[PDB]
């Protein structure tokens, strides 16, 4: 399943200095980008528009523009009312997935609200001042109707357009390569195993152990580094039709 995630970061230094930057991921692939220094949402793949028309897409272009400027000023004004202190960080994570949707908002890196049903609701562990913000946001009937239309109708119709358009790149397979090394000793030693240059993301590497994090390469391929304190290294992956990558020490 390939969820579509739309991310936003809005930073407020003082009441004069602010920035808002955004992005969209389709599964692991990033399909859009949108910076503060730009009056448009930028497409990244030749299929980023999916099965939407130019007129359809341009309408989306017009909505986001109005929203970015309004969001900014709504937040500066909320700052006075709620007497909050600068700096302020706000983040938004919105989207859906074709089989339900979502729209979460965070402040200083903690959840505060979200868009359920037809309106805004707080999160279980939120401050009292959030009640004031929820009370005001829920007055704008047109915005509440517009977020519903966007999540219930526009997003799901959009994601499909993408899936029948980016079927090559999504169902693509890249083979990894692998090698061993000797790190810094803890008379103990450290056996490090390096697996790099694979795609898609789901992978499997063990010593047959500290299986490291999956780290990104700049060509949308991935990288992994599992270690052991003290023998073989084995890697499974979809690209390897059962035939695993066994490297011996």
């Amino acid at each position: 399943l390939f969820p579509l995630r739309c991310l936003q970061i809005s930073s407020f230094a003082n009441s004069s200095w602010t920035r808002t930057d955004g992005l969209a991921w389709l599964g692991e692939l990033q399909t859009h980008s949108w910076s503060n220094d730009s009056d448009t949402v930028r497409s990244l793949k030749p299929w980023s528009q999916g099965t939407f028309s130019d007129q359809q897409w341009e309408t989306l272009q017009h909505i986001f523009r109005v929203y970015r400027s309004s969001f900014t000023r709504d937040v500066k004004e909320f700052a006075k009312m709620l007497r909050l202190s600068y700096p302020l960080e706000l983040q938004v994570s919105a989207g859906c997935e074709v089989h339900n949707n979502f729209f979460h908002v965070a402040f200083q890196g903690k959840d505060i609200l979200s868009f359920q049903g037809t309106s805004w609701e707080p999160t279980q562990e939120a401050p009292l001042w959030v009640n004031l913000a929820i009370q005001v946001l829920n007055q704008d009937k047109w915005t509440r109707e517009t977020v519903q239309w966007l999540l219930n109708g526009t997003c799901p119709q959009f994601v499909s357009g993408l899936l029948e358009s980016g079927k090559s790149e999504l169902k693509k397979q890249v083979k990894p390569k692998a090698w061993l090394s000797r790190g810094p000793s803890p008379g103990r030693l450290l056996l490090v195993c390096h697996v790099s240059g694979f795609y898609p993301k789901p992978v499997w590497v063990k010593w047959m152990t500290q299986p490291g994090d999956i780290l990104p390469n700049a060509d949308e391929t991935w990288y992994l580094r599992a270690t052991l304190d003290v023998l073989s290294c084995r890697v499974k992956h979809s690209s390897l039709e059962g035939q695993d990558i066994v490297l011996y020490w």
């Epitope: 109005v66 309004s70 709504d74 009312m81 007055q139 704008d140 009937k141």
Partner: T-cell receptor, first 114, second 112 residues
Framework: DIYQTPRYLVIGTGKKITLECSQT?????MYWYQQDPGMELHLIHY???????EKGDLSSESTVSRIRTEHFPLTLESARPSHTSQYLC??????????????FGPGTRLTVTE | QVEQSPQSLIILEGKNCTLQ??????????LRWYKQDTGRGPVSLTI?????NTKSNGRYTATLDADTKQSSLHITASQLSDSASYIC?????????????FGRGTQLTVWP
């Protein structure tokens, strides 16, 4: 349902002045405008609720207080002759349709003499 | 941000008139027309959103063309009690979080 007392007011120069405004509904949002005869309304103060007191689109020597929802008093620290004007109070709330209308008080006329 | 026209005008009773209001406010939520008698508070006449092109409150009738950002107030069968100041204000949000923009008003004198 929005009240302003008194309706008229004479006072001497250099003394303090307080202007009453009250509303029997429960509207949070409230505004103070100052309007010179034969001219426009200028916002001088407003409030989003109790303990909220923001300066408006005009720099007056006045101050407001919102310690109670229903009352929004305007106060002149030390009155000068140039404070002679008309002062209107107002509020915002949900009404006949599904929108937030603004309702104005009747107003108060202040004359400051020497 | 919000303009009205004319500044003032003088008509005789029994005649119709039309008052203009132009705005550059974006984004747009709704627009109201107020009537202010000398030495009194303004009185709500009408409020309109973009999805409406007409509203009538008694002898008063407001239209709103959202596409050219203009609304006009039309007084039918004027009389001496229509002498007042007529104000038009625009709001840029559908909540109390908005900003209100006022016109300088229009003074209307009605003679016998």
């Amino acid at each position: 349902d929005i009240y302003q007392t008194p309706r008229y007011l004479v006072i001497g120069t250099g003394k303090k002045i307080t202007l009453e405004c009250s509303q029997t509904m429960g509207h949070d949002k409230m505004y103070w405008y100052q309007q010179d005869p034969g001219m426009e309304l200028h916002l001088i103060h407003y409030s989003y609720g109790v303990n909220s007191t923001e300066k408006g689109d005009l720099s007056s020597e006045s101050t407001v207080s919102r310690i109670r929802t229903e009352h929004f008093p305007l106060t002149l620290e030390s009155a000068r002759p140039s404070h002679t004007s008309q002062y209107l109070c107002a509020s915002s709330g949900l009404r006949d349709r599904g929108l937030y209308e603004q309702y104005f008080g009747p107003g108060t006329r202040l004359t400051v003499t020497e | 941000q919000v303009e009205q026209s004319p500044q003032s005008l003088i008509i005789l009773e029994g005649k119709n008139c039309t008052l203009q209001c132009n705005y550059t406010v974006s984004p747009f939520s709704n627009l109201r027309w107020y009537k202010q008698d000398t030495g009194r508070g303004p009185v709500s006449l009408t409020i309109m959103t973009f999805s409406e092109n007409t509203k009538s409150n008694g002898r008063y009738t407001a239209t709103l063309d959202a596409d050219t950002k203009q609304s006009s107030l039309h007084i039918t069968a004027s009389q001496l009690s229509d002498s007042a100041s007529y104000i038009c204000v625009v709001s840029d949000r559908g909540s109390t979080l908005g900003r209100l923009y006022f016109g300088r008003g229009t003074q209307l004198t009605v003679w016998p």
